[PDB]
Amino acid sequence: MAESSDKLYRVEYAKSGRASCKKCSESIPKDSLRMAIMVQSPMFDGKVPHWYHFSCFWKVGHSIRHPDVEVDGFSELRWDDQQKVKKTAEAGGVTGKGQDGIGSKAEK
Ligand SMILES: [Zn+2]
């Protein structure tokens, strides 16, 4: 849509293991929660997402101050994940090792 990437931040559930972590240099599991950052591309004519694990956003260490505005894709999350993403932004981040999965079929 118009100005779809005029944000800083993205959050969503992972449909498949096609995204890779720009922060811890591993790959992101499917049927799990992930975040990304909106950066101006050297290779593309606009803003592009830098994907990483949900905990890895808070290892990049950015603050979020109006999360339902700044975190694109938050509208697709269910209430328990919306409450946890907003609570994590109020809490100043959560930074643990996260999932044991990496992007494979039936990895849970
Ligand atoms: Zn990671």
From Swiss-Prot:
Effect of residue 44 to A: Abolished DNA-binding
Phenotype when changing residue 34 to E: Abolished binding to DNA strand breaks
Zinc finger (PARP-type): 9-93
Annotated consequence of substituting residue 43 to D: Strongly decreased homodimerization
Phenotypic consequence of residue 34 to A: Abolished DNA-binding
Binding positions for Zn(2+) 1 per the UniProt entry: 21, 24, 53, 56
N-acetylalanine: residues carrying this PTM: 2
Role summary: This cleavage form irreversibly binds to DNA breaks and interferes with DNA repair, promoting DNA damage-induced apoptosis.
Designated name of the protein: Poly [ADP-ribose] polymerase 1, processed N-terminus
Gene: PARP1
From-to range in the entire protein, with total length: 1 to 108 of 1014
